[PDB]
Subunit: 226 residues, 4 copies
């Protein structure tokens, strides 16, 4: 029900804040995502482990014209700030939205969670090119190739198998990276990348047809914790 | 920007609607002040905040919202490796920030701007105790009427108002008065300094009302300690 | 092991030479107690030390070196993921540890052993203030003569002696009495608890002398905070 | 002037504490080195950067029958606990003395420093097999091949070039790893390894003729900071 937006032309990221009054934060926000994570500038901090309690409740995969998204049943959760944030969906960007020390990864997954009070936590996972990713291949095998199309998953999705083994992370306070770019979003960005094959990357690039990362936004007053 | 205050239909709950320019007061999710729950704050390797103040006070002003000492902007603190220049300091009673749900009777804000206009506020809490000598210099020329500036009669050394121990809480927040712009660095010192009850009462009476904004939800933020 | 004490030719400086068994008192480089300089201590992600004590006091003994409450060893704390069982607790005046070069008037040590004989000591500082109810139960049966045990007349709840805030300094050290064995985990709580001046004075008079070992050099160690 | 010791037989590490009363700490010490560094058990902490102010004041290389050691003039220093510890010598062990998560590296360098008050700080650098190490090759080219022999260095030694680029470290309180195994030694163990070629490793192994690492010792009451 929100105004139409995209990644280029008159509806691209530089214009989002003018597409609708609902999208104001895109242009006036000072706590926007994604960001560059400069590891030296980040603050070493006593960050609590982010406990993962996922379940295999995937409903379908959808190509919504902005990403490839797996929609979940909402029963699995992570624990952040002692609260349960339930896994609602995960989706993908290429190139990465976040950068580390000024460099992109070729691909980034976002696991989007909602607590019962309506607050959002996103877990970000970077991918590098290497070995074929078995869990990703379950989704890729049935990737809808046109926008507006959804497909049944033919294999049981285990979302935790997409996360890195090492669970060290960067944390900061940010926003959604797509309109309305609402703030008050908790970001948990895992430091260790996972792997996907070049073929998997190129399938995503070909199906999408364009890059779908928002440009990095100024840190402003924020510190990233590490 | 419209007239605003601390009670009635122009009080803090109404701010965001008084002018479109004040919208962040209502819609922002990284607003100040906050309650600082010490147990919930995250232990972090925070850099010392070095202070290089000079005695460049220009005047004291009662602007109807606070008593404010305006500076020449030559002194500075170092935050994130950058110089933030001390433009003014001013006061609130009761405190704006709380610690573990409790107010201090009084809080001072030292407001700094870097060369690109980014704002850093250093907050100092005060408790009732011995008369504060440095504060006494400002109080001796406190203008009793809003809209009046008075010249200082003594040399102001702003660093003498800060606590001796320089450990602090840090978080990202906002200005505490309209337009409540975000992108503000907050450095809140953990150790309070003392003022006499008479110094406190003079401020309370000259203001004529409490001038603290209610604490705002932390939302996605952590406080570092 | 030879007779040792807190003054004359059997005092702390002479300990290491009284018996070959006491050599570490003299040659060890990770000895306790220490001065805890808070500014020098390293901020660290220290695990909470969970306390699971039970009321299993057996007796109070004056052993000529301290007043000690001997426990049944059923209660425990969790340190490094392991259970360390509370064997006894005892007292020193003035404090053994100092903080920023200052003593507290009194310090309690809660001595624990894991299943393999590794020792963890929890230290609690006391300041003069209100009479301590839990300490009063022990004091009511304090044996006045060395070599005497007395039974308790009230149920001892040792956790009631610990401060409410459980934040602590940690370092690796030694026993503070001969043979001053190393390999001892020290958990020193930052917040003091209160005792009356009369409770303090009773202990000082029953002992008849100061029973604190002088602080020892940190050498290669850091204190975590 | 101390009693003769070695790495095997009746004079090996299990016997060091009985070889001389001077070596007592080898058998009774509870703060001995080297150790296993379990990264999960280590405590994340606000460790100060260890500033390096080395100079090229190498005097000679020596094969002393226990290691290959480069002896320095003592003018270069590192800063630890706000004090200058001067670089006196550096030397090598294979396999590594320290282990990380129960695993050895094939080689470890130790840079030994002395403050003016007589306190020792050792910086440890792990090596893995990979590319030929240019700074190490300056020493290796003139490695004395028999115990008791010293040789002139034919190239200017720059000791800082042996340290890893990333200067993150583990710190703990320990001992010398050779008799007398004196305690009160500050250990700074860099987390990131550097590389040496297989040929460089095998030259060291061949010249030494035996492994020269002391077995790891119990952590006891200690925490390692990271
Ligand atoms: N609704 C929504 C959820 C997550 C994101 S993202 N790309 O920031 O994770 C954007 C919109
Ligand atoms: N301009 C301005 C400066 C500082 C503050 S305060 N009250 O947050 O320090 C508010 C407005
Ligand atoms: N055995 C023993 C137990 C504890 C201590 S103390 N004083 O270090 O707690 C000394 C000896
Ligand atoms: N003297 C000496 C210095 C350093 C070491 S070592 N191997 O622990 O660095 C041993 C002895
Ligand atoms: Cl946290
Ligand atoms: Cl340090
Ligand atoms: Zn996304
Ligand atoms: Zn203010
Ligand atoms: Zn004791
Ligand atoms: Zn060595």
């Amino acid at each position: 029900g929100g105004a139409h937006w995209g990644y280029s032309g008159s509806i691209g990221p530089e214009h989002w804040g003018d597409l609708s009054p609902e999208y104001l934060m895109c242009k006036i926000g000072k706590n926007q995502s994604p960001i560059d994570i400069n590891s030296a500038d980040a603050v070493k901090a006593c960050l609590a482990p982010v406990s993962v309690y996922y379940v295999s409740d995937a409903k379908y995969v959808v190509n919504n014209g902005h990403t490839i998204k797996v929609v979940m049943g909402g029963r699995g959760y992570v624990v952040v700030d002692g609260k349960r944030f339930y896994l609602k969906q995960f989706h993908f960007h290429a190139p990465s939205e976040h950068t580390v020390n000024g460099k992109h990864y070729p691909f980034e997954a976002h696991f989007v969670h909602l607590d019962k009070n309506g607050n959002i936590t996103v877990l970000g996972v970077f991918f590098k090119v290497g070995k074929e990713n078995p869990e990703l291949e379950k989704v890729w095998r049935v990737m809808p190739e046109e926008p507006g199309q959804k497909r049944h998953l033919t294999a049981r999705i285990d979302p935790e198998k997409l996360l890195p083994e090492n669970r060290d992370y960067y944390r900061y306070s940010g926003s959604l990276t797509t309109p309305p770019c609402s703030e008050g979003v908790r970001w948990i960005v895992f430091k260790e990348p996972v792997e996907m094959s070049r073929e998997q990357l190129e399938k995503f690039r070909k199906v999408m047809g364009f890059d779908n990362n928002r440009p990095v936004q100024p840190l402003n007053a924020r510190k990233v914790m590490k």
